[PDB]
Design a protein around this ligand. Sequence first.
Ligand SMILES: [Au+]
Ligand SMILES: [Au+]
Ligand SMILES: [Au+]
Ligand SMILES: [Au+]
Ligand SMILES: [Au+]
Ligand SMILES: [Au+]
Ligand SMILES: [Au+]
Ligand SMILES: [Au+]
Ligand SMILES: [Au+]
Lengths: 141, 140, 135, 140
Amino acid sequence: PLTQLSLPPGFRFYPTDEELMVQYLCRKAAGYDFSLQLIAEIDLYKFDPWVLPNKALFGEKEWYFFSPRDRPNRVAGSGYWKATGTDKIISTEGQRVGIKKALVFYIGKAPKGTKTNWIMHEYRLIEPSDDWVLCRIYKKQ
Amino acid sequence: PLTQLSLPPGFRFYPTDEELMVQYLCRKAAGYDFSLQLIAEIDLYKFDPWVLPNKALFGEKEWYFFSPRDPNRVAGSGYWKATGTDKIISTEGQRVGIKKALVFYIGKAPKGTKTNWIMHEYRLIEPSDDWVLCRIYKKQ
Amino acid sequence: LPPGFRFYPTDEELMVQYLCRKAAGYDFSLQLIAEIDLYKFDPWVLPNKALFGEKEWYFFSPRDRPNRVAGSGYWKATGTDKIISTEGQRVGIKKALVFYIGKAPKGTKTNWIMHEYRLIEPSDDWVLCRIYKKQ
Amino acid sequence: PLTQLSLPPGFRFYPTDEELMVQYLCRKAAGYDFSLQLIAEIDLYKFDPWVLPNKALFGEKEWYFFSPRDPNRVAGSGYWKATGTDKIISTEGQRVGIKKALVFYIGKAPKGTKTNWIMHEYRLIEPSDDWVLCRIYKKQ
DNA sequence: GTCTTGCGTGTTGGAACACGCAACAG
DNA sequence: CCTGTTGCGTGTTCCAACACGCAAGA
Ligand SMILES: [Au+]
Ligand SMILES: [Au+]
Ligand SMILES: [Au+]
Ligand SMILES: [Au+]
Ligand SMILES: [Au+]
Ligand SMILES: [Au+]
Ligand SMILES: [Au+]
Ligand SMILES: [Au+]
Ligand SMILES: [Au+]
């Protein structure tokens, strides 16, 4: 799924925050198509993070996904995800287009759960008062 | 030199220390297609690094070169000064290369003032074509 | 009294050497922690009423037998009220407050803080309060 | 060394960063009574910090020392490693001192493992007796 | 209580800044 | 030779993400 790219050796996906927003988040959302499906659709909140890697179509230490947008410490699998730091803003050409928000997995039942090195980055579209978020998943260290 | 490859958005050139040594540097001696065509042969030490960005086949805040394998070798109005700890690069538990850090100083040694231009000089572990591969970028 | 030296009582001393002494009604060599009715005041006038202290002032106030109004505002309880122990016996609770100015719950927060120490007890009655302004 | 002073309960030694510099460190050169008698002269770098608590004239979870004014100076089975941001200490808008954070590592640099033993090394801003004042304590 | 997102504030190893032993040439 | 003038090691200072775990609020 990375292969028929014939990618030369040494080349990897190191998208900027802005590309994930524009080339990934926008493309899917206006519902326009991709040459290849690279970032698969998944329901991220049905799972333990550690099984997630197997479901992403490419990636060694980061895996990326699309998940239905929520309509807080949202439970997922055997645990719950806790929001961290100050959710951050993505800009392009002086327009705010998205928020990148970080998470940490706690296993268990809140707020007595135990922290892991499992991380999620949730990208979301900025918007006014086919609805997805884009998530980077990885395990720290 | 990128657009023949038909890249999906988001892909950039981020080779590991282990790949530059293994997939790039040794392979140059071996004649590989994608490796011959992706990095410019250039003598880094005939130039000021800030002339160098224009001499790279592509690149955004970093550039890579092969330069003839040869201390504080003069280049332009300065000299490249080694910094930090030379690193041993290993592949599959076998040692293949060494990573060396450098900083560009302007003026005449050792009375130069340090600048933000940086070099990483990588060489293979092997006895006496014969190149080092260098990354150039500007800090901060 | 000598230099470089300041009152940095542990939670436990305030409970034992301060709260207990006054409550069994035993006396002090000097009155250090004055009696005041803390709930009659704006926190910012309080500093002038304490007998010593540069950024923390301590007081004793009659014990209540919630967002208790005081002056131009109301005090809002915060965090999880905490327990003081000595030699394995629970003797007190330290409870933190923040001053809101105005009328609850639409008042506005300040950096004015109270720490209220109270005696643990079974199912001449005082609390001990640390006052300070944050930052 | 406390009980000559007749302390009321609750009083402890909590000097400000500004006082340690002003009331303690400069005054040592000036010969003041209460300052000579309250802090032990000791060479912190000849010892492991955990031997040090017993070498302090008093203290509960922190200890203070004067140590001869002199990088990763060896002490015992380790080295003290600088951490955080050196701080400028000012008095009445005049700069008098610098505060430096340190961590004790056990073993041999730079292959030691970090421990919970901490030092704060305070020095006066002034040209070339001549001491630094150090606080020692243990995390957790 | 219950179940958050926030925001301070803290720790780690990365990265150059800079020393003085090295090593050759004059 | 023994001094000169010119690098490379390496140790210590630095600073910046990356998040901790609390405590406010919803
Ligand atoms: Au956009
Ligand atoms: Au958009
Ligand atoms: Au699995
Ligand atoms: Au090789
Ligand atoms: Au008032
Ligand atoms: Au006033
Ligand atoms: Au008691
Ligand atoms: Au109170
Ligand atoms: Au001074």
